[PDB]
Design a protein around this nucleic acid. Structure first.
Ligand SMILES: [K+]
Ligand SMILES: [K+]
Ligand SMILES: [K+]
Ligand SMILES: [K+]
Lengths: 259, 259
RNA sequence: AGGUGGUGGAAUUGGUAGACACGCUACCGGUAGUUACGGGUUCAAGUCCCGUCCUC
RNA sequence: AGGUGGUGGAAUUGGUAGACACGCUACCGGUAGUUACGGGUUCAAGUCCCGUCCUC
């Protein structure tokens, strides 16, 4: 028998499942995906995702892979799949990927995106999927201050307690009344991202200094900075890989929000 | 007793209710809004909305009004309300509006917005709320051809069978992989909007002539043009009013999608 | 000057209260389990008045 | 050349089938109610093969 390895770019609005990973009781993405996906090969399939993203967390670039003895025409895998998939999980693309690949492992670096309302007045354009902030923010600052964590420092101050991850780019802008964050750090420590935002969103609305970003970073402490950033607003928009593999990689959303 | 009239800009993701208007059995916006809203004055309230928008139809500018003998500090009306409101209905603003006002009636002209995916691959960034199209579209055209219904003609060709409504602006663009439509016609005939899109979306993917827009318009027939446009993708982003009244009017979404 | 779940610690500074972190018991990363009292005003009270009983 | 709910009329041209329109019975704008047959291949068949029985 020939086992075929193929990773696929899946896309999923969180909001309603309890995160990625399984565990007999409730319901997860993987659960959903695993099942459907495997139903289409009669050989019970198990997926290997590249970012065990948890509850109320969205993805639009999450990519997974797996092996099988079954064979398709790139269709069951694309069109097929999300057909047996609940309208909040989709496939985006597929690729006959070389055995030496790994999703979690071949991975080289990630990129998340944080969204936020600001009207002072909870949105209705779907709750779960944005988190809105009250008191008025300041982009110029948000981004202004954050832009220095790219150094590389001890993020031990943002790990919910190797605290040496490498940041490549920060970026905090206000496309509309929303403010949008994005980062492409080599790797990530627990939440972080999230504890970053809070501890950055704080600076946004003032209440804290502009320079303060460098304080707690250097300070090197979690039990100092701002509260972890809600949840319903994270967007894993794509994980970076090597070009040997050559994945298909399209617009990372989460919506019009251009790459 | 002094009855107070006040209209308020409400915002609502459709998707899950069965439209605006009530009727003992199921569940509607108005139902939701009516209730909550009225709970906050102990005088059973009835709303008067300015666009009885139906099932799976979104609003982000829908505005309603009503009268009451109760009195507030602009808070129960804003913050209060959507607190007693399900996360898919929000208030956006309120205004102590002059008795001579009317929501449906004082209205002068409307503006809808249509969204669409195009990946060939159903999105997961919430279904209900977008409708995605298969075969690849053409904005340059979409908008190119539509731009002539602003004349005013017999739309009797788009009324699901006075078929003389006045169009002020059409507009069909591709902010991202989405294509986005918007129109500000004085008034509207049954669906229309919707039957327009289909009969315009057709031109988008070809299958029909570029000039064809003027054909059926002049043709003056419904049982000729393309199928009515899905549903889960309409966005009543604001209704235009007179400046005597002076409403507060903020960004019309539906998201970052800038005014 | 105040008092919130097994603690710390918050509440668009009248609005689904317990966010966010944290601790031990289970159980195949989860899910379960282990607003001081009495009134009052208001459409609503952790937050506002009258009180009893606490507290550095 | 084909055959789909009370009809017309479609199905990312193997994928939750009945979209979109339309007709009469109720009932305080709604909600209810009034894939030709037998097999086969495939993980899946309105759509693909073998068939019976229809059809301009
Ligand atoms: K206040
Ligand atoms: K045991
Ligand atoms: K095909
Ligand atoms: K009767």
């Amino acid at each position: 028998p020939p086992v075929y390895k193929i990773a696929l770019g899946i896309e999923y609005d969180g909001s309603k499942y309890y995160g990625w990973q399984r565990q007999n009781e409730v319901r997860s993405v993987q659960e959903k995906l695993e099942k459907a996906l495997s139903q289409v090969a009669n050989e019970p399939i198990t997926v290997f995702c590249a970012g065990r993203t948890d509850a109320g967390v969205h993805g639009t670039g999450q990519v997974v892979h797996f092996e099988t003895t079954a064979l398709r025409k790139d269709a069951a895998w694309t069109l097929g799949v999300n057909a047996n998939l609940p309208g909040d999980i989709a496939v985006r693309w597929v690729k006959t990927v070389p055995d030496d690949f790994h999703a979690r492992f071949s991975a080289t670096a990630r990129r998340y995106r944080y969204i936020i309302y600001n009207h002072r007045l909870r949105p209705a354009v779907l709750s779960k999927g944005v988190t809105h902030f009250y008191e008025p923010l300041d982009a110029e600052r948000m981004h202004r201050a954050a832009q220095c964590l790219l150094g590389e420092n001890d993020f031990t101050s943002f790990r919910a307690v190797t605290p040496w991850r490498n940041v490549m780019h920060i970026n905090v802008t206000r496309h509309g009344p929303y403010v949008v964050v994005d980062i492409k750090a080599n790797a990530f420590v627990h939440h972080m991202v999230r504890n970053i935002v809070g501890s950055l969103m704080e600076v946004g609305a003032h209440n804290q200094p502009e320079s303060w970003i460098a304080e707690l970073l250097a300070a090197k402490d979690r039990t100092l900075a701002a509260a972890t950033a809600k949840a319903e607003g994270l967007y894993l928009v794509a994980v970076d890989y090597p070009d040997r593999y050559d994945l298909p990689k399209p617009p990372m959303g989460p919506l019009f929000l251009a790459d």
